[PDB]
PDB file of C-alpha atoms and ligand atoms in Angstrom:
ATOM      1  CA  UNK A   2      15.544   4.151  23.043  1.00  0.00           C
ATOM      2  CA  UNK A   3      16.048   7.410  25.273  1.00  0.00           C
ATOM      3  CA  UNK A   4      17.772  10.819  23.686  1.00  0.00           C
ATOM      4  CA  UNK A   5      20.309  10.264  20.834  1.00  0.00           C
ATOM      5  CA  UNK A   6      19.881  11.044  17.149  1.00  0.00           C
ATOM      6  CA  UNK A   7      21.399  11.232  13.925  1.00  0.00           C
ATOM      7  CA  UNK A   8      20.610  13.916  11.283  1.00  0.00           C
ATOM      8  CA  UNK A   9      20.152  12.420   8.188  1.00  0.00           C
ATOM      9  CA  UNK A  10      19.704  14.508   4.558  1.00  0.00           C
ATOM     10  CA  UNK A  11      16.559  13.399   2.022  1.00  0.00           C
ATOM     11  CA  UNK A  12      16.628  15.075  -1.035  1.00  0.00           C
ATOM     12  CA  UNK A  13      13.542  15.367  -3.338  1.00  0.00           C
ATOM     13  CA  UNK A  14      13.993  16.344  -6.970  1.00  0.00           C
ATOM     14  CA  UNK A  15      12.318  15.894 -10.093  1.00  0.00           C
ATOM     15  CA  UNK A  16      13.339  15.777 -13.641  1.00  0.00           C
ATOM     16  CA  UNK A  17      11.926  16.336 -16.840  1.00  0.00           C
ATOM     17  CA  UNK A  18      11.255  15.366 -20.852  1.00  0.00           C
ATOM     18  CA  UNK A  19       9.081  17.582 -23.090  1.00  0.00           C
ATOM     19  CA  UNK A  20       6.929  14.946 -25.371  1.00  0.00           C
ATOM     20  CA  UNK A  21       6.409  16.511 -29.015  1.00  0.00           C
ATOM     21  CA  UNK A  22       3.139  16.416 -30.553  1.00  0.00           C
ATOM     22  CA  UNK A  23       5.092  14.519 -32.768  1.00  0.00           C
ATOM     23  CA  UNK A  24       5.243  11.249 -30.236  1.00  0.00           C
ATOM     24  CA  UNK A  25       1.556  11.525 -28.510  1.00  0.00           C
ATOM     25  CA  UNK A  26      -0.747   9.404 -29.638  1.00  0.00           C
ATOM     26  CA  UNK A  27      -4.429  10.792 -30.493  1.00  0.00           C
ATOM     27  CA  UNK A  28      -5.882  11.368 -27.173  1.00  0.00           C
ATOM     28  CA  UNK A  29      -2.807  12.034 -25.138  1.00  0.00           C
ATOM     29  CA  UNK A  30      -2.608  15.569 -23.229  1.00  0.00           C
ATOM     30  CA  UNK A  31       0.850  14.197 -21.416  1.00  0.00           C
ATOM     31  CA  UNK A  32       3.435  17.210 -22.806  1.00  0.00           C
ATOM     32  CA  UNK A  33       5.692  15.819 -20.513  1.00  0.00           C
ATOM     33  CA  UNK A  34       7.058  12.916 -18.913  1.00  0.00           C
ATOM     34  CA  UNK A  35       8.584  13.074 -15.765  1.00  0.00           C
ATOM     35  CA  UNK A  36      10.540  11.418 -12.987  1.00  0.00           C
ATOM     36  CA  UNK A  37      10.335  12.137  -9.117  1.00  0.00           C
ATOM     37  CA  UNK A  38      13.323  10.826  -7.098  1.00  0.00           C
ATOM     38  CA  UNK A  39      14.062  10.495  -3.474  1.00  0.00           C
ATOM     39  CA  UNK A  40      17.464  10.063  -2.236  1.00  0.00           C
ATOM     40  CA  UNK A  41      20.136  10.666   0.655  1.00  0.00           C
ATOM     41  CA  UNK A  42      23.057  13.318   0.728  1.00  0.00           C
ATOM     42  CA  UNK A  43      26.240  12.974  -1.528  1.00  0.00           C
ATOM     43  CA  UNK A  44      28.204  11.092   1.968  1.00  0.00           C
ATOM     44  CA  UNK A  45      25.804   8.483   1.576  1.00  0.00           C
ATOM     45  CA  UNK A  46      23.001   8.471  -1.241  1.00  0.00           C
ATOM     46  CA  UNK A  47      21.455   5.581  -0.481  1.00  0.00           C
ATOM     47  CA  UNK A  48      18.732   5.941   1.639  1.00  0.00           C
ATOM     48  CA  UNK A  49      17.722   2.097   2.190  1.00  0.00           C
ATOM     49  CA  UNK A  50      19.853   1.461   5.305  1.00  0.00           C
ATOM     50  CA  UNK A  51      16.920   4.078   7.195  1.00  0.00           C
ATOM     51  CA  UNK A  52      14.235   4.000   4.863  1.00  0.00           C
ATOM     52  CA  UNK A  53      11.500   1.224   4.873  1.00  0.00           C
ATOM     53  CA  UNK A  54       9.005   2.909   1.688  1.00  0.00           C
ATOM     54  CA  UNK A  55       7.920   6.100   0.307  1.00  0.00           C
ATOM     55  CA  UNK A  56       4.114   7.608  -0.445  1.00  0.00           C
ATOM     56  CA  UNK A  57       3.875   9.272  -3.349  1.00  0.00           C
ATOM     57  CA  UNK A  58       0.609  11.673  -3.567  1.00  0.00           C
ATOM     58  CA  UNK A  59      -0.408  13.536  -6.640  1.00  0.00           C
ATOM     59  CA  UNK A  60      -2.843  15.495  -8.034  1.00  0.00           C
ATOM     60  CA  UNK A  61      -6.789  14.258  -8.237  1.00  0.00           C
ATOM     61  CA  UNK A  62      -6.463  14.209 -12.195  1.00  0.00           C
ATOM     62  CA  UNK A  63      -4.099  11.383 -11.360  1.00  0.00           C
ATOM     63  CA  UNK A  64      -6.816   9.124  -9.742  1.00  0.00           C
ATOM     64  CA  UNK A  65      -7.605   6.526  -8.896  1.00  0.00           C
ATOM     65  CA  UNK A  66      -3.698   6.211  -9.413  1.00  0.00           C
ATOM     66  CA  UNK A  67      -2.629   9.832  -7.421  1.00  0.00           C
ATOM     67  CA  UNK A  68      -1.139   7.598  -4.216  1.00  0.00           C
ATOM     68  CA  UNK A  69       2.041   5.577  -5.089  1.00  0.00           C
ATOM     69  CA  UNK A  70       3.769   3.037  -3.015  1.00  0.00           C
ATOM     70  CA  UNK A  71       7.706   2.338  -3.949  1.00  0.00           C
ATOM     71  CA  UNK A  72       8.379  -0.009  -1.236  1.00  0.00           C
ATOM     72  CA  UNK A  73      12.150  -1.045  -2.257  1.00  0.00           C
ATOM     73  CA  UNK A  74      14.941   0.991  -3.463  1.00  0.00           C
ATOM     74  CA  UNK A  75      15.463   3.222  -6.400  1.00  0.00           C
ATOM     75  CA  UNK A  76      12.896   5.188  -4.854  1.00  0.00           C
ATOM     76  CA  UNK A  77      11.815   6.604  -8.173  1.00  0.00           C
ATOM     77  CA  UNK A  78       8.651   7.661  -9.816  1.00  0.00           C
ATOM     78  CA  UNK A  79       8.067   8.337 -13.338  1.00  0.00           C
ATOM     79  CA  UNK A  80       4.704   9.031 -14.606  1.00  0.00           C
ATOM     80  CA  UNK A  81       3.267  11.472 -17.934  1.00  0.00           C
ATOM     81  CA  UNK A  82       1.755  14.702 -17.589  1.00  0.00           C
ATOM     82  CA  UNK A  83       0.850  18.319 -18.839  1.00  0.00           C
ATOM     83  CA  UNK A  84       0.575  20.263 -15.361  1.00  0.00           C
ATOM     84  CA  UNK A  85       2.860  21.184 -12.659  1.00  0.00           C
ATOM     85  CA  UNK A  86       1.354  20.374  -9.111  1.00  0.00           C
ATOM     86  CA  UNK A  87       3.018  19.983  -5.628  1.00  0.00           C
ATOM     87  CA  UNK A  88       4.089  16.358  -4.439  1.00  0.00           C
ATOM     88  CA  UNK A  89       3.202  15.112  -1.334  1.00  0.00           C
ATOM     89  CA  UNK A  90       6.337  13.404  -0.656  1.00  0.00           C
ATOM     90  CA  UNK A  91       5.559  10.790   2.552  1.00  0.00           C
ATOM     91  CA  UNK A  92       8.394   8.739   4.043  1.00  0.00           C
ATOM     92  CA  UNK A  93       8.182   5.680   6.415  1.00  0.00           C
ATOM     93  CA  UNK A  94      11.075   4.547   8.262  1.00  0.00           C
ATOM     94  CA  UNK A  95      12.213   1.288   9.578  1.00  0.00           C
ATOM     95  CA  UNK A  96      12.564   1.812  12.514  1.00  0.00           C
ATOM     96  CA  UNK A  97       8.893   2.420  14.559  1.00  0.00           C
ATOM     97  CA  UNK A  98      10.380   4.995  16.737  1.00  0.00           C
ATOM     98  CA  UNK A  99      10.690   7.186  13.772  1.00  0.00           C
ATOM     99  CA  UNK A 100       7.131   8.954  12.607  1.00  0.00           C
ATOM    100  CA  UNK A 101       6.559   9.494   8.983  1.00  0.00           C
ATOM    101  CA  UNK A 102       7.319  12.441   7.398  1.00  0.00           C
ATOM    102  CA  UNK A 103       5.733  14.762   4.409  1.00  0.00           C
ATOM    103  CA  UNK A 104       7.624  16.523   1.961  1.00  0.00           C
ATOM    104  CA  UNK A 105       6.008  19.192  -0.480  1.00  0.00           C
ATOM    105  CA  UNK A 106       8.058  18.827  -3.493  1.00  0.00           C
ATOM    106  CA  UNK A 107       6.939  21.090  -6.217  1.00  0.00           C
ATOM    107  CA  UNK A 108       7.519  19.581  -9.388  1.00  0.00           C
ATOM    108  CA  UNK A 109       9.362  21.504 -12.023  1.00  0.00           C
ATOM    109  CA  UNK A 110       8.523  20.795 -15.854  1.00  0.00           C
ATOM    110  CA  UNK A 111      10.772  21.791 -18.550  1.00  0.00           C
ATOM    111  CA  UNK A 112      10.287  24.654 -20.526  1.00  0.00           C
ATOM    112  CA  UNK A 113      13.743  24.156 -23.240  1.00  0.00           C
ATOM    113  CA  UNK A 114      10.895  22.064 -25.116  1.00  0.00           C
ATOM    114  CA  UNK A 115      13.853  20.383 -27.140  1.00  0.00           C
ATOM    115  CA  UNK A 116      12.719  16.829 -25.709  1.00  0.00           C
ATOM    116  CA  UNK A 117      15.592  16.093 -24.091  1.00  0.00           C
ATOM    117  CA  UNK A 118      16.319  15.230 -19.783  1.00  0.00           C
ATOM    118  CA  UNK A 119      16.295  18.346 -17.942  1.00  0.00           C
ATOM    119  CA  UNK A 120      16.567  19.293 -14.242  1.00  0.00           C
ATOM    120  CA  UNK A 121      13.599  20.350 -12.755  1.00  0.00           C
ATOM    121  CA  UNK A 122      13.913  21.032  -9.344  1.00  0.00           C
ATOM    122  CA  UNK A 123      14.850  19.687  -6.042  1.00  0.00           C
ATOM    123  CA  UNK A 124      13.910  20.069  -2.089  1.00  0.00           C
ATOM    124  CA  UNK A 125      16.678  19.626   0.335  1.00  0.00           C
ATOM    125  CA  UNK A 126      15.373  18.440   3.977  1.00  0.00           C
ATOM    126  CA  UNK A 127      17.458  17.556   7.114  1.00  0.00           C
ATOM    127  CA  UNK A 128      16.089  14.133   9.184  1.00  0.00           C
ATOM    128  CA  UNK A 129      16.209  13.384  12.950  1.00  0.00           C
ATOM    129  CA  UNK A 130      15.604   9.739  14.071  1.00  0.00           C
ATOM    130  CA  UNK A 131      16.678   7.551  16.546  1.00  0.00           C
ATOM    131  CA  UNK A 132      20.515   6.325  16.764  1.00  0.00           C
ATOM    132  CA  UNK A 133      20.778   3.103  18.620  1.00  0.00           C
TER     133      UNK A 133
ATOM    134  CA  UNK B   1      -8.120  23.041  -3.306  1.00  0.00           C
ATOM    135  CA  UNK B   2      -5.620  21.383  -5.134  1.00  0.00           C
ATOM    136  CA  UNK B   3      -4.398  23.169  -7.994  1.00  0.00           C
ATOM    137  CA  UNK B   4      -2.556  22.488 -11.278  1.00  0.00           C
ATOM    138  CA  UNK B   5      -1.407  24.255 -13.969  1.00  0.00           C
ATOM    139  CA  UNK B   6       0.702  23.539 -17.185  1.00  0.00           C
ATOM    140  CA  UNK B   7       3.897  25.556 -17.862  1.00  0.00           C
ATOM    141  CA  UNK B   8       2.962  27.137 -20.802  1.00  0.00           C
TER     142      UNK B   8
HETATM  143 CL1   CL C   1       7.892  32.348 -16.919  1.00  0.00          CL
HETATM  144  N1  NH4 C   2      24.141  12.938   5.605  1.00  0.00           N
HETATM  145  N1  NH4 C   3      12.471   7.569 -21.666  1.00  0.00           N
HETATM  146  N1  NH4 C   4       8.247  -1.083  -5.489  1.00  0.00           N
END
């Protein structure tokens, strides 16, 4: 309905756990696990009120499960790994005036290898969609 | 292409 917006603020980020040979099983290459998040801005961080579900696409090593649907909030994603790869972030809005968008997150592994949480990285984009 | 590549 006609001219009006609101900018909105996603934020993409990623974080990190280095897996010791010492907790893979046999045949596991994961090094890593990791965690890809999508949320709003510190004024409001939850992104539910705008957001109807998020497309997660990865790498082809990760099919047939490289496209992930989290339809309902925390919109999270954890999965294991060994390589660093840019995410395909895709949002869908509630409201059909809105057009999906893509966001290339480049996921950040950690290097402190002490197998603890670290902070990988995170992408920082600004959202128009319709106010009314 | 889609590329990957570990950290170390
Ligand atoms: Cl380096
Ligand atoms: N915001
Ligand atoms: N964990
Ligand atoms: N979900």
């Amino acid at each position: 309905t006609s001219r009006l917006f609101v900018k909105k603020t996603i934020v993409v980020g990623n974080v990190s756990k280095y897996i010791p040979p010492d907790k893979r099983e046999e045949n596991d290459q994961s090094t890593h696990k990791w965690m890809v998040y999508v949320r709003g801005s510190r004024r409001e961080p939850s992104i539910n009120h705008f957001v109807k579900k998020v497309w997660f696409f990865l790498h082809p090593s990760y099919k047939p499960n490289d496209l992930v649907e989290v339809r309902e909030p925390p919109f999270h994603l954890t999965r294991r790994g060994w390589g660093e790869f840019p995410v395909r972030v895709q949002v869908h809005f509630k409201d059909s005036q809105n057009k999906r968008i893509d966001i290339i997150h480049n996921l950040k592994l950690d290097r402190t290898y002490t197998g603890l949480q670290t902070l990988g990285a995170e992408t920082v984009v600004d959202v128009e969609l319709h106010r009314h | 292409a889609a590329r990957k590549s570990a950290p170390a």
